[PDB]
Amino acid sequence: STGSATTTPIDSLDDAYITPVQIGTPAQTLNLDFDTGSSDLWVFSSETTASEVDGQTIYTPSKSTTAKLLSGATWSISYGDGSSSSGDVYTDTVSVGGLTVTGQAVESAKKVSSSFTEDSTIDGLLGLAFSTLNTVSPTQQKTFFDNAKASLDSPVFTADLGYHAPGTYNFGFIDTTAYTGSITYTAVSTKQGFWEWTSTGYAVGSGTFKSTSIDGIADTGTTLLYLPATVVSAYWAQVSGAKSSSSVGGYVFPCSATLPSFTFGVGSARIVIPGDYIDFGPISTGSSSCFGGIQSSAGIGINIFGDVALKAAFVVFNGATTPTLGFASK
């Protein structure tokens, strides 16, 4: 089997991407944030505290003939941005882009933090990291991908995120029309539960490539590119007037600037992030200070190849017995 679904930016900055997902019988379609940095499929629901729902579409298990309470199971998750959610668990039929999993754990939120409430466009998350990170207790649950894997034509999914435009998540096949040149594959460590890999270096603009190992995670659920302070300083040093602002929470730059590109290495291959991808616009409405899309990972504890990086590439998440990651230009 295979699946193919379009993913759409939630706003004009590509802050996140939503993908429609069919849950239950008859189908209830919710727009979920596919997150390769976590491993829970959770939704706004009829159980979510009413004051914490503001415009989201909810899953109502009592209206699904295939829903079953997973008795005694609870879940609770905290994300790198400080947001969180928790609740109980149903199993139900879940379909993505024509690919159907029966008996998928659908984690129903009883509580969500303010950032979720305030984002009316995201109805929940669909985790695509390794199932060892799943938070359901006392019986850990499998991700949608893990459940689908044995039925897939090939044990892979691909992320093809757009810049200010829709893109695609495919399951079970590699669309050879969706990228240019060849795909370069690189080793993955699953030790921390992430799609963790080592970039071979970077360049700023038309500058020379610096060969250096940068361990990080491929994370579709993180907006920006978070890299070591040395790398980030080297990038922003090439933008007149750019500076790190503790008050704002990172590097800002004059909105009048033209940003240089940023290149990262994948083996001997190179992925180029155009400068425009690194512009996250005014820090507040009408400001002439703009927020940067490359930020320091210092104090996160891990480097994160978030959407800024991933949307510059066609990315293969190879979930074979020995997992790997593939990157191609597009």
Q: How many structural domains compose the chain? A: 2
Q: How many CA atoms lie within 13 A of 129 on its CB side?
A: 26
Same-domain check for residues 162 and 245:
no
- Residue ending a domain, among 123, 153, 174, is 174
Q: Quote the domain boundaries for residue 249.
A: 175-330
The one-letter amino acid code at 109 reads A
Q: 69-88 burial, b for 16+ CB within 10 Å, e for fewer?
A: ebeebebebebeeeeebbbb
The residues near 208 (Cβ < 8 Å, ≥ 6 apart) are none
Which of 165, 133, 128, 141 lies closest to 315 in space, CA to CA?
128
Same-domain check for residues 117 and 220:
no
Residues 36 and 107: their CA atoms lie apart, in Å, by: 17
Same-domain check for residues 26 and 158:
yes
Q: Peptide bond before 26: cis, by omega within 30 degrees of 0?
A: yes
How many residues are recorded in the chain? 330
Same-domain check for residues 83 and 208:
no
Expt. technique: X-ray
φ/ψ of residue 259, rounded to 5: -80, 140
Same-domain check for residues 162 and 202:
no
Structure tokens belonging to residue 233: 């300083």
- Given resolution (angstroms): 1.2
Q: Are 17 and 8 in contact (CB under 8 A)?
A: yes
Q: How many CB atoms lie within 10 A of CB 50?
A: 7
Same-domain check for residues 162 and 25:
yes
Q: Are 31 and 19 in contact (CB under 8 A)?
A: yes
Would residue 199 show up in a list of annotated catalytic residues for this protein? yes
CATH number for the domain including 71?
2.40.70.10
- Residue ending a domain, among 137, 156, 174, is 174
Q: Are 30 and 123 in contact (CB under 8 A)?
A: yes
Same-domain check for residues 140 and 275:
no
Same-domain check for residues 69 and 194:
no
Q: Are 177 and 265 in contact (CB under 8 A)?
A: no
Same-domain check for residues 309 and 195:
yes
- Residue ending a domain, among 174, 208, 241, is 174
Same-domain check for residues 146 and 181:
no
Q: Which of 35, 146, 279, 307 is catalytic?
A: 35
Same-domain check for residues 142 and 212:
no
Residues 52 and 31: their CA atoms lie apart, in Å, by: 17
Kindly give the pairing relationship between strand 99-112 and strand 167-171: unpaired
DSSP states of 131-157: GGG---BSS----HHHHHGGGSSSSEE
Query: Given its phi and psi angles, is residue 276 left (phi above 0), alpha (psi -120 to 50 degrees) or beta?
Result: alpha
Same-domain check for residues 112 and 134:
yes
Q: Which of 38, 108, 131, 199 is catalytic?
A: 199
Q: Are 35 and 221 in contact (CB under 8 A)?
A: yes
